[PDB]
Coordinates of C-alpha atoms and ligand atoms in Angstrom, one line a residue:
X1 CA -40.7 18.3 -17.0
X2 CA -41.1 20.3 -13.7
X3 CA -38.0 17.7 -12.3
X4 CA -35.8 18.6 -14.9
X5 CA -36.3 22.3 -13.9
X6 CA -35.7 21.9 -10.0
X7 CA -33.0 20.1 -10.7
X8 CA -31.4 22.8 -12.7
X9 CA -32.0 25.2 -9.6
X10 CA -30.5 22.8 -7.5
X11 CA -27.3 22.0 -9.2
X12 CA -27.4 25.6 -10.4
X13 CA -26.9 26.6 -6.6
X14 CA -24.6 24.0 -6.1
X15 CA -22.3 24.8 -8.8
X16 CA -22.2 28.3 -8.0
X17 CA -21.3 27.5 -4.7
X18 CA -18.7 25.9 -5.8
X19 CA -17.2 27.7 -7.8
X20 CA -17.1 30.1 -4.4
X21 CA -15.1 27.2 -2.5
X22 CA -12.8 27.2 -6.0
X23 CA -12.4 31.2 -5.5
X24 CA -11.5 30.9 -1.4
X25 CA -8.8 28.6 -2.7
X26 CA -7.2 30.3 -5.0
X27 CA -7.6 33.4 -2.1
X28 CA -5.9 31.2 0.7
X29 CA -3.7 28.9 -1.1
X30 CA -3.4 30.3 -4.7
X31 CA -0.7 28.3 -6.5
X32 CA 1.2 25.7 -4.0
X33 CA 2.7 22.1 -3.9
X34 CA 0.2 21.7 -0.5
X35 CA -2.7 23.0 -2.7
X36 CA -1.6 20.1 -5.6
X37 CA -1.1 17.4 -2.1
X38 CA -4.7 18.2 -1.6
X39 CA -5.9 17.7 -5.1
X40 CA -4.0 14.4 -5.6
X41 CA -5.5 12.9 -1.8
X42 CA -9.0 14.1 -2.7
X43 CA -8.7 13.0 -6.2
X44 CA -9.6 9.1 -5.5
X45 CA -12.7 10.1 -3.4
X46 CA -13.8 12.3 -6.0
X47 CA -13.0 9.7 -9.3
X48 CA -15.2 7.7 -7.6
X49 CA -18.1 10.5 -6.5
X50 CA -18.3 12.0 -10.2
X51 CA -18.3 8.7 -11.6
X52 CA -21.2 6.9 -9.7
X53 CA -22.9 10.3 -8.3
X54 CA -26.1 12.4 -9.8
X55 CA -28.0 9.4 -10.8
X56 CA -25.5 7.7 -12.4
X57 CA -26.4 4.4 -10.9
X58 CA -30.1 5.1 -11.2
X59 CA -30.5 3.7 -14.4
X60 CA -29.3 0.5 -13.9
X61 CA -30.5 0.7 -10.1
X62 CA -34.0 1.9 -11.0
X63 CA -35.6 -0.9 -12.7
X64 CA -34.0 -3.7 -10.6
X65 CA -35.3 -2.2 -7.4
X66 CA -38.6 -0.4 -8.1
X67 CA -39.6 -4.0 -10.0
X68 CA -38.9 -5.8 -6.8
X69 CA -42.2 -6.1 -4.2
X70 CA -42.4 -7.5 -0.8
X71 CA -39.1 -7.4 1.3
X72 CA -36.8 -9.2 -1.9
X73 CA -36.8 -5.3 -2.6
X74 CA -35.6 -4.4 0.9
X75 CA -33.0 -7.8 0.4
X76 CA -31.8 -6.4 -3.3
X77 CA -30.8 -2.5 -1.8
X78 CA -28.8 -4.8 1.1
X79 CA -27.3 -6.8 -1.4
X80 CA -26.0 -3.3 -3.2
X81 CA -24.9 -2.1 0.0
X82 CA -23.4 -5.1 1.2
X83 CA -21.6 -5.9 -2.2
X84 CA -20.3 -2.5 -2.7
X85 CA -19.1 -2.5 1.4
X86 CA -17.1 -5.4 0.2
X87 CA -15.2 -3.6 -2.8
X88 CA -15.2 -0.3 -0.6
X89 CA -13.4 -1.9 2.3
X90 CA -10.9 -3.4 -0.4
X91 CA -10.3 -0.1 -1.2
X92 CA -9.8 1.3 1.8
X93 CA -7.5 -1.3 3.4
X94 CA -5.3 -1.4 -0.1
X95 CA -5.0 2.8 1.0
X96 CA -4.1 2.6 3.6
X97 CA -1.2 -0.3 3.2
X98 CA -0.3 1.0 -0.3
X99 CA -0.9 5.1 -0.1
X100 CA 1.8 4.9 -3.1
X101 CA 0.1 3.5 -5.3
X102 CA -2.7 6.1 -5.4
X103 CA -0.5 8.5 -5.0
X104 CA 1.3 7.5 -8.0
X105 CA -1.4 6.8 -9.8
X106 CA -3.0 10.4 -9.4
X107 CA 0.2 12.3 -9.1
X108 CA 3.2 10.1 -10.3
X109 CA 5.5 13.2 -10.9
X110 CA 4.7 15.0 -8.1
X111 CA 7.6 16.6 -5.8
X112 CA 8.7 14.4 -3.0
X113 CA 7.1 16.8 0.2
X114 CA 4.2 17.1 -2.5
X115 CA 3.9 12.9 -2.2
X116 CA 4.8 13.2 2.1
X117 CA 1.7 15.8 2.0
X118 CA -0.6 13.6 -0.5
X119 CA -0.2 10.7 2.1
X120 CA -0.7 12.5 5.1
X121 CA -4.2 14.1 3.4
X122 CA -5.1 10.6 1.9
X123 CA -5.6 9.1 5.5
X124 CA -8.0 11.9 5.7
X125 CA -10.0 11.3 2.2
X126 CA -10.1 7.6 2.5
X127 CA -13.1 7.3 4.8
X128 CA -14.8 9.5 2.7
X129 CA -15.7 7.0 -0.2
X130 CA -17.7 4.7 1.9
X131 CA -19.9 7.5 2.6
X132 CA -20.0 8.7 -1.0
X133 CA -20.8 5.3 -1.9
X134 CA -24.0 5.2 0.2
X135 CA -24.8 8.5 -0.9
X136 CA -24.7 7.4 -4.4
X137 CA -26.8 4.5 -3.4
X138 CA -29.6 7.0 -1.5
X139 CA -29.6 9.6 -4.2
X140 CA -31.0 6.3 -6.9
X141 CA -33.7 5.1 -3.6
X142 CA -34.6 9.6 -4.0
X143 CA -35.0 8.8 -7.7
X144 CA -37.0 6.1 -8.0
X145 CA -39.8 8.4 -5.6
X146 CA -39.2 10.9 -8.1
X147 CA -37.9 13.9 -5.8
X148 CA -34.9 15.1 -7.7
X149 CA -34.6 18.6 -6.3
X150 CA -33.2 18.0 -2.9
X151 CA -31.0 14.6 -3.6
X152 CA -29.6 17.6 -6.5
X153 CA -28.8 20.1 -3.9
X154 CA -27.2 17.9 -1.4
X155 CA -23.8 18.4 -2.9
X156 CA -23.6 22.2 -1.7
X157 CA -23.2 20.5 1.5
X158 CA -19.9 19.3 0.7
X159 CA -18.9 22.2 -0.7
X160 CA -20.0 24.6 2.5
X161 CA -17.6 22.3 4.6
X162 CA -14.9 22.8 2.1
X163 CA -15.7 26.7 2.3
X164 CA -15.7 26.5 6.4
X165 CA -12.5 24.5 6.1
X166 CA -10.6 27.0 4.1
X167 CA -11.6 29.7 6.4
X168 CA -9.7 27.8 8.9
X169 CA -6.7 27.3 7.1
X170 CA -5.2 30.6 8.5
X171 CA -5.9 29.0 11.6
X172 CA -4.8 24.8 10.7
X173 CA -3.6 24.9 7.3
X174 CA -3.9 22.2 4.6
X175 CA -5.8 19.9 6.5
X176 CA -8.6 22.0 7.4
X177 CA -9.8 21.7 4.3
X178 CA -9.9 18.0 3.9
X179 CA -10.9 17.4 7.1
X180 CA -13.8 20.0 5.8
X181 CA -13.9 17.6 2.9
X182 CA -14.5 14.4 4.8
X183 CA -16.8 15.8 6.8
X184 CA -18.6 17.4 3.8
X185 CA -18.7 13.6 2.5
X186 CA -20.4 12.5 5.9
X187 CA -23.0 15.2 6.1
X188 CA -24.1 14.5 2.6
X189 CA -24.8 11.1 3.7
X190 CA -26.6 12.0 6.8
X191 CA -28.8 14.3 5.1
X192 CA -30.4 11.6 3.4
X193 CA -30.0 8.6 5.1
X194 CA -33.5 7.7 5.7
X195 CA -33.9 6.3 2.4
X196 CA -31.7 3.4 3.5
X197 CA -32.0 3.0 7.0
X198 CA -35.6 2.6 6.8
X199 CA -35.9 -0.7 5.2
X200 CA -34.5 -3.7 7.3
X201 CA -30.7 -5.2 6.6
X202 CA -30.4 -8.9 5.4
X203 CA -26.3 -10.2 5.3
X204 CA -26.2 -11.5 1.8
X205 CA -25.4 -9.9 -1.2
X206 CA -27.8 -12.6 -3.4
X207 CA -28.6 -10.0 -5.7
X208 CA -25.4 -8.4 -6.1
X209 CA -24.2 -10.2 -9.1
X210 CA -27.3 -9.8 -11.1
X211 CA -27.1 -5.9 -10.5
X212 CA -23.4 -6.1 -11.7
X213 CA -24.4 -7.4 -15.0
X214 CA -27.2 -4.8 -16.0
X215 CA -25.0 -1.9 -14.4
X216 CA -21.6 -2.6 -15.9
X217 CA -22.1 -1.1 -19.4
X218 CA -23.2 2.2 -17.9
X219 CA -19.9 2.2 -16.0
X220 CA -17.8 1.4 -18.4
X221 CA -19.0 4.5 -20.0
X222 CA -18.5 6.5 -17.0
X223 CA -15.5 5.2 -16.6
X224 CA -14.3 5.8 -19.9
X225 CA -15.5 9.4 -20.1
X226 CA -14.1 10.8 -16.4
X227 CA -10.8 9.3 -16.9
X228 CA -9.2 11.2 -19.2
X229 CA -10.0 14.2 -16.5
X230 CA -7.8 11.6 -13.7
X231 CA -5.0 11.6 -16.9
X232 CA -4.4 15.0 -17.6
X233 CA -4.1 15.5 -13.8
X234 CA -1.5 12.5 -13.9
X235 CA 0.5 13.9 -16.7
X236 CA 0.8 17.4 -15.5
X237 CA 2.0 15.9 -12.6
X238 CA 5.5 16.0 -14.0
X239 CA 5.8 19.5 -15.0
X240 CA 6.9 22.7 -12.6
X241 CA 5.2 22.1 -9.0
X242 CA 1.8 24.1 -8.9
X243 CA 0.9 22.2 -12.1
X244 CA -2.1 20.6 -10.5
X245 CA -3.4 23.1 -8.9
X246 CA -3.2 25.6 -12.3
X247 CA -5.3 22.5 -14.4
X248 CA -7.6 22.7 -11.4
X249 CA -8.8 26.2 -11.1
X250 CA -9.2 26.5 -14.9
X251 CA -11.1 23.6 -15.2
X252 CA -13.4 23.7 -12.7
X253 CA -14.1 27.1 -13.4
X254 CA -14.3 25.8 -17.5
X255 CA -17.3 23.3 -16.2
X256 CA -19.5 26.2 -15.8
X257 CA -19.6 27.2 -19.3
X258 CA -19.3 23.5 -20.2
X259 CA -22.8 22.6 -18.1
X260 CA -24.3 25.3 -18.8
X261 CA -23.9 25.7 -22.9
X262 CA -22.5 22.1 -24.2
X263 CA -25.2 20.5 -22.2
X264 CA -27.5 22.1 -20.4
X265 CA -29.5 24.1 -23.2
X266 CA -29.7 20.6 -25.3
X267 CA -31.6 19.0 -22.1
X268 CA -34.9 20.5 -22.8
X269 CA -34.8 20.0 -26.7
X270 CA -33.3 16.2 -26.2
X271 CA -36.3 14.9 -24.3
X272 CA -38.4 14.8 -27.3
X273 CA -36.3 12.3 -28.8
X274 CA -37.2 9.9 -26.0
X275 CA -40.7 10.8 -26.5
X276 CA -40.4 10.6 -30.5
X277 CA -38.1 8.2 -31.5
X278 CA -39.5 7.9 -35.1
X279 CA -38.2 11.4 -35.8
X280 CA -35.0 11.1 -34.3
X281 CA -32.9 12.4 -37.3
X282 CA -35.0 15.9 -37.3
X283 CA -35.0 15.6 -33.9
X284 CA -31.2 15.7 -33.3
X285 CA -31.0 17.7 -36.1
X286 CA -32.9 20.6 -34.2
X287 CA -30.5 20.0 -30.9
X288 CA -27.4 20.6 -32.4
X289 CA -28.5 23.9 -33.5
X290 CA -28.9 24.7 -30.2
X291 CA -26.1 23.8 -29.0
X292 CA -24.0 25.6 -31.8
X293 CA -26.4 28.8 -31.1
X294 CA -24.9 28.8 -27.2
X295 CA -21.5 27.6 -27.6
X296 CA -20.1 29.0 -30.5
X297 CA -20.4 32.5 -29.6
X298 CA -19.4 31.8 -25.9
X299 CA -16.4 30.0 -26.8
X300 CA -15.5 33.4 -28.6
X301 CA -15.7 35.7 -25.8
X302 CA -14.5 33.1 -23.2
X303 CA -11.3 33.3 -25.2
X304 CA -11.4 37.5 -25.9
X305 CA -12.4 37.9 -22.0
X306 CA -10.2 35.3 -20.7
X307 CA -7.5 36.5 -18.5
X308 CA -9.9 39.8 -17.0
X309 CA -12.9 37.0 -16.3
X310 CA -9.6 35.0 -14.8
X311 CA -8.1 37.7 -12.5
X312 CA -12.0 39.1 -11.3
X313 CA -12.5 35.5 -10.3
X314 CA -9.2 34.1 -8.8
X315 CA -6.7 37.3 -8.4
X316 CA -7.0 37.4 -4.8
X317 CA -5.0 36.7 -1.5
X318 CA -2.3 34.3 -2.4
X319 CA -3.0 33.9 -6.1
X320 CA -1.1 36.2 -7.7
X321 CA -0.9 37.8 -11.4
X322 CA 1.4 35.2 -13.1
X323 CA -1.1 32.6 -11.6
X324 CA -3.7 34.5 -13.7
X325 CA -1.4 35.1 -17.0
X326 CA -1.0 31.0 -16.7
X327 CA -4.3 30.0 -15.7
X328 CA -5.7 32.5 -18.1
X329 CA -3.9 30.5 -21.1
X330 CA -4.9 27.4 -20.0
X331 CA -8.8 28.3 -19.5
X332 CA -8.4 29.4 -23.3
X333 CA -6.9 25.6 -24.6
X334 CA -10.1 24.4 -22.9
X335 CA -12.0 26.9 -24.6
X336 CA -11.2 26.0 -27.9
X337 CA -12.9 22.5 -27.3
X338 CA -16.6 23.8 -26.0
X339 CA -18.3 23.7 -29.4
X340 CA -16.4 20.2 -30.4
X341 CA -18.1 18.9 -26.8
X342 CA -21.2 20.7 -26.8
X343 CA -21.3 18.9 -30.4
X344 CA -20.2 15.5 -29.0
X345 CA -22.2 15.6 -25.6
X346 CA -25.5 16.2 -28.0
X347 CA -24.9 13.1 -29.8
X348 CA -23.9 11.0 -27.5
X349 CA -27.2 12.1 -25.1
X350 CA -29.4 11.5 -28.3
X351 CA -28.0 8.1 -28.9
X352 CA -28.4 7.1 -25.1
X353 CA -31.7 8.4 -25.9
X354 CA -32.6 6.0 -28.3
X355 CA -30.9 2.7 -26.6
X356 CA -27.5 2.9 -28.2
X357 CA -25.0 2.2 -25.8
X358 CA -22.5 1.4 -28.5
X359 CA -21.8 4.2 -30.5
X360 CA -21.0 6.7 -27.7
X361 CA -19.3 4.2 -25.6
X362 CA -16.9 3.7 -29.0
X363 CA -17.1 7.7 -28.8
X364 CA -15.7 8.2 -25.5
X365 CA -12.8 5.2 -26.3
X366 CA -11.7 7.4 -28.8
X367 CA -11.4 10.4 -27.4
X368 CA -9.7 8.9 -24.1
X369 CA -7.0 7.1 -26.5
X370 CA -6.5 10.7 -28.6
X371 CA -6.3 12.3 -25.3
X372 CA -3.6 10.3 -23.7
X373 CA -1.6 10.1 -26.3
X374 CA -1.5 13.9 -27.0
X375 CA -1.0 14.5 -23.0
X376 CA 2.2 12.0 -23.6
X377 CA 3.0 14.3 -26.5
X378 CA 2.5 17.6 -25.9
X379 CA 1.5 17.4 -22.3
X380 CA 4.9 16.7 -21.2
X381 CA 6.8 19.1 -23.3
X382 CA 4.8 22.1 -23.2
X383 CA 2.9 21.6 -19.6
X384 CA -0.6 22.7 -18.6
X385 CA -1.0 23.9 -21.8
X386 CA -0.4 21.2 -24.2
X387 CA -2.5 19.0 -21.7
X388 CA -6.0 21.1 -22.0
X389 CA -5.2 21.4 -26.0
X390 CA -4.9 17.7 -25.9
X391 CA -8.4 17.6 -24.5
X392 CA -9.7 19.5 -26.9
X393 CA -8.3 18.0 -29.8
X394 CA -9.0 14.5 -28.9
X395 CA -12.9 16.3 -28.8
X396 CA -12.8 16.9 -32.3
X397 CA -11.6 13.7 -33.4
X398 CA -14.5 12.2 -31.2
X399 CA -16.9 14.8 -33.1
X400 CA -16.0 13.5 -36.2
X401 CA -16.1 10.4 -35.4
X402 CA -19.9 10.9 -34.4
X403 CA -20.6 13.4 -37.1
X404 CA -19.6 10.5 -39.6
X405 CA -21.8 8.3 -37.7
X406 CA -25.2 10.2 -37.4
X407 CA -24.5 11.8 -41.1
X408 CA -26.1 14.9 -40.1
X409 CA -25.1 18.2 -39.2
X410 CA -27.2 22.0 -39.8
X411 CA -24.5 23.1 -41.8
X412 CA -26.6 26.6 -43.0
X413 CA -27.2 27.7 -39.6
X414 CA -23.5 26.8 -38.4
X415 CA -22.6 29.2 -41.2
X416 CA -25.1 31.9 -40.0
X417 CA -24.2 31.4 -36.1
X418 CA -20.1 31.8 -36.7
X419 CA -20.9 34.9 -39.2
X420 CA -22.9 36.4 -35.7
X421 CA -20.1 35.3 -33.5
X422 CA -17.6 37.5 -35.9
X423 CA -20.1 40.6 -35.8
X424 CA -19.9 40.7 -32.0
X425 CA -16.1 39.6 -31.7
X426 CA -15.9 42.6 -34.0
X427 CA -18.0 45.1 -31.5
X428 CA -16.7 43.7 -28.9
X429 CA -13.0 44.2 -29.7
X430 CA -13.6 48.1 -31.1
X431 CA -15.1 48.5 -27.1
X432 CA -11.6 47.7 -25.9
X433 CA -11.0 50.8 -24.2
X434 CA -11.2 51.6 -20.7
X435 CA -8.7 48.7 -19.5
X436 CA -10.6 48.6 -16.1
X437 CA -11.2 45.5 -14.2
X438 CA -14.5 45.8 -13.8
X439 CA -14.7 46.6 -18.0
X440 CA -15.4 43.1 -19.2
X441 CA -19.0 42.6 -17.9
X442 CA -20.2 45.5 -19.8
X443 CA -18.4 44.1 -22.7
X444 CA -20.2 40.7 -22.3
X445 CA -23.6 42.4 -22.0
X446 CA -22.8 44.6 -25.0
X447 CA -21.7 40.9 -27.0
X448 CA -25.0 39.6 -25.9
X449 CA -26.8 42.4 -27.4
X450 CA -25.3 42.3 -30.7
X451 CA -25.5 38.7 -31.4
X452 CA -28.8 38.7 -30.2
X453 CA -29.4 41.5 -32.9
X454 CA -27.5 40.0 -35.9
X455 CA -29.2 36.8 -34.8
X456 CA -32.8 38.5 -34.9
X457 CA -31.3 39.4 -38.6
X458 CA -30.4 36.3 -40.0
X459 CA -33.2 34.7 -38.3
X460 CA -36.6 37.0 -38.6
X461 CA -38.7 34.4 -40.8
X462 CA -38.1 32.1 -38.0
X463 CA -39.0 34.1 -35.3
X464 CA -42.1 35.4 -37.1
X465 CA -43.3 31.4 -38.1
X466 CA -42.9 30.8 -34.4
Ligands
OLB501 C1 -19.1 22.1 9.2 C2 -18.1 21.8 10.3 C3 -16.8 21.7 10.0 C4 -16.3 21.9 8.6 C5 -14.9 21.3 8.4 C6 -13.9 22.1 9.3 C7 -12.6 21.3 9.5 C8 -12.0 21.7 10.8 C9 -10.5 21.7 10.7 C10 -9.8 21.5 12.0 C11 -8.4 21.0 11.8 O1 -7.9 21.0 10.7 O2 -7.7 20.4 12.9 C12 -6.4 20.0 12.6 C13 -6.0 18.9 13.6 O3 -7.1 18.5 14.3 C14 -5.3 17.7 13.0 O4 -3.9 17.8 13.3
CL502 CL1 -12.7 20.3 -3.7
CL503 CL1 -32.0 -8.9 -8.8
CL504 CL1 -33.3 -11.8 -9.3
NA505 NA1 -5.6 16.5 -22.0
ZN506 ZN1 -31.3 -11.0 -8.5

């Protein structure tokens, strides 16, 4: 629909964005215990932002608030508020009495001036839930009036304090950019705050209960799903000081590859299932070709383009080249998973799609249990490294897992797609000559080409029909 396209400009902007506040760190910081301090204070907040943020709420929230007429509708959004003020609060207080335990529990192993640091930023992050929370809470009121653009861009907010922040960390140092990030978390609120303070405040949280019941399941899944990414942080806690900080720059930048091939192109294709349920088997079918046709060949030049796409990115200011020989490696472990969760994500969106909450909810318990224990394994022995392969291992198992359960796969055009994504790894590696920074580009545009070619072979009689 014309929503689901503004909302990919927004977040598109957003992300990009971000990944410029991910660059100016590795510029200003690189590779640092103080960098990892930050990362384990602002870790809490934003567990709790990616977990209830983008509508994550809304789909519980939607239908108990937009059913509601009169001012009971104006008393349910105060019970929400009022409810989650009381758990927030909690939170907060338990921070600020016990900053060890969330310490520990986001960076156990971390160096002792890593922990002093963590605390000293974590006074800083706390306040910033609360505000995150209400935003959460505004963003579903946006959604139920069916503006999606604007509630989608606010997070570039955030992320231009951030920025603004790290510019002045020449000036203040490590705290500039939390203090850019609580701020961030305040102006996000602000910026939509009318939503809420429009309609008038009642002290009760009557409703509160009701809401906890019909939103629960979807949490659990959120839950279930982010925390792996709060685990691997965790375990690579105990390795060499800096760990943190390597898992976060090739991650984050990983997620733009991730959103934009594993689940992005799937979006469009995956509404018709909600639409068409009766043909949800040739449905699906259809989306995971799709997904295959991005991700497959992607996945291959991620890995072949890795460490130049790493050091155009990040190998500036303080990060320095063995920062981009490890992060380079670790970007590729990810790597090896995007299919697997391009394959899984499909799935488990098509099966939300038709009212299944079990199946992907057993999904995601899989893959979180496969993905601790391999970043108990090999996390601990071989570092960064073992931790993203973990991730992507546990992916596959989940894969199969859901792959035995839908008992349908395109197998033929799997075959066709990977023969495609040979012929350009082929071309693409006879180009390797120059050995200039700048070299890699060209080579993904002259990738594109060719599997767009082969593809136009192996696929004429289906571009002609259509
Ligand atoms: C947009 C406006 C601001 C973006 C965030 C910039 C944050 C400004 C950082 C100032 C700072 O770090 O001061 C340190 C001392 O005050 C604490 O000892
Ligand atoms: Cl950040
Ligand atoms: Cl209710
Ligand atoms: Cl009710
Ligand atoms: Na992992
Ligand atoms: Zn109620």
């Amino acid at each position: 629909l014309f929503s689901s396209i503004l909302f990919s400009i927004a977040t598109f902007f957003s992300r990009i964005l971000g990944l410029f506040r991910d660059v100016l760190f590795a510029k200003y910081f690189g590779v640092s215990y103080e960098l990892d301090a930050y990362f384990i204070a602002i870790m809490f907040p934003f567990f709790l932002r990616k977990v209830f943020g983008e509508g994550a709420m809304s789909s519980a929230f939607v239908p108990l608030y937009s059913e509601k007429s009169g001012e009971e509708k104006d008393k349910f959004l105060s019970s929400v508020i009022n409810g989650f003020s009381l758990i927030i609060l909690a939170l907060v207080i338990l921070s600020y009495f016990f900053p060890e335990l969330i310490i520990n529990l986001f960076g156990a192993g971390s160096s002792h001036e890593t922990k002093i640091l963590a605390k000293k930023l974590l006074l800083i992050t706390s306040p910033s839930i609360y505000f995150i929370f209400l935003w959460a809470i505004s963003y579903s009121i946006l959604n139920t009036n069916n503006k999606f653009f604007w509630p989608a861009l606010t997070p570039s907010i955030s992320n231009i304090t951030i920025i603004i922040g790290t510019f002045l960390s020449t000036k203040y140092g490590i705290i500039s950019p939390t203090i850019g990030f609580l701020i961030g978390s305040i102006l996000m609120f602000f910026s939509i705050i009318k939503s809420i303070i429009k309609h008038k405040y009642y002290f009760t949280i009557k409703h509160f209960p009701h809401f906890l019941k019909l939103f629960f399941p979807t949490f659990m899944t959120m839950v279930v799903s982010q925390i792996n990414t709060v685990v691997d942080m965790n375990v690579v806690s105990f390795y060499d000081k800096g760990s943190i900080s390597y898992l976060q720059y090739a991650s984050r930048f990983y997620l733009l590859p991730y959103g934009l091939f594993a689940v992005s192109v799937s979006t469009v294709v995956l509404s018709k299932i909600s639409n068409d349920r009766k043909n949800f088997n040739y449905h699906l079918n259809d989306a995971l070709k799709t997904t295959l046709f991005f991700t497959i060949p992607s996945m291959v030049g991620l890995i072949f383009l890795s460490t130049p796409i790493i050091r155009f990115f990040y190998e500036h200011g303080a990060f320095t080249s063995k920062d981009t020989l490890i992060t380079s490696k670790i970007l590729i472990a990810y790597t090896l998973g995007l299919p697997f969760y391009g394959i899984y994500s499909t799935i488990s969106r098509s099966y939300h799609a038709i009212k299944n909450t079990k199946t992907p909810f057993i999904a995601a318990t899989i893959v979180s249990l496969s993905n601790i224990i391999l970043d108990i394994i090999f996390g601990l022995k071989y570092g960064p490294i073992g931790v993203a392969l973990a991730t992507s291992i546990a992916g596959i198992i989940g894969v199969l897992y859901l792959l035995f359960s839908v008992k349908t796969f395109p197998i033929k055009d799997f075959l066709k797609i990977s023969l495609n994504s040979l012929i350009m790894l082929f071309v693409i590696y006879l180009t390797d000559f120059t050995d200039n920074e700048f070299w890699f580009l060209i080579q993904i545009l002259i990738g594109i080409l060719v599997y767009l070619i082969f593809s136009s072979i192996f696929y004429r009689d289906l571009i002609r029909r259509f």
